[PDB]
Amino acid sequence: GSVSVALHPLVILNISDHWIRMRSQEGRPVQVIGALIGKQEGRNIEVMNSFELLSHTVEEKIIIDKEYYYTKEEQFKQVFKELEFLGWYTTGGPPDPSDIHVHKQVCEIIESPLFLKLNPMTKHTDLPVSVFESVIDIINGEATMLFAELTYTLATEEAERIGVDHVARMTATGSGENSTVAEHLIAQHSAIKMLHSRVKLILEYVKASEAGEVPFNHEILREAYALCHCLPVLSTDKFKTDFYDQCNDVGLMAYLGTITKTCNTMNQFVNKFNVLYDRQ
């Protein structure tokens, strides 16, 4: 089915940085246009990096100029050798005909370009980005460029996970008055909700099989029974003793640490008291 798209957690950060930069510079958020670069291996397409392309406006329409891309194409060839043009990204919602018009000269530059959509105004659990492939229609007349939606993967190299965890541990939670609770108790809440959704789907399938909407597949129900019988995990005495020991240890570690915040407030109080009601 067409080509397999390999998306990396580096293009998205570039788009977000560009969007926030323009939003802060102009005050009123505007549309941003860039590019996508990577590798073509047979029927597989992978995206490595992304650099912005200058775009001009004429009347009300947007035009991608060729000279700036020509000058910038050989510039980054020095650092990245086996890197070639793939497509471009932009910010927006649904595919408007302006997208088709702007994609016309992209198809002129490269026969079959890819398309990336990032929607900062998303209110859904799905990935805000979307990958589209260009299709040329055969019907006579105005041959509109058709966007075929494909599947995007999350292929990553060795250093991606460690970097994202390192940056996401802090997130400057203690400077924006966002409360560390509102981060910790919320980050895993989404995972718990996802597990709830999966269990609900399994229960719905089991109920449908019981009623008779779906055929009696006498293989999935065995796995469902096995999953059912494995719910009370590790109800032994050793686990309970270890858990209680852990709880007591964390309680003591919190006591040593509350006892010093109280002491610091104590010190500040005596420092302020030694100036107001007592001379020197």
Binding site: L252, Y255, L256, I259, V270, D278
Partner: protein, 57 residues
Amino acid sequence: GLISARVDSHSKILYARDVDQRSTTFEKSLLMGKEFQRRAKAMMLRAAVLRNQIHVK
């Protein structure tokens, strides 16, 4: 405080004594916390009495 041992006079045997680090750690921390609370309340009473000019004339 040179030898950590216990004497059993029934069989006349000197046993070695092993200290449970977790238990003594918890006991010391609890004792320190109680002492600090007592000292804090004492000083706060002092601040209450040193602000009203109580000096036993």
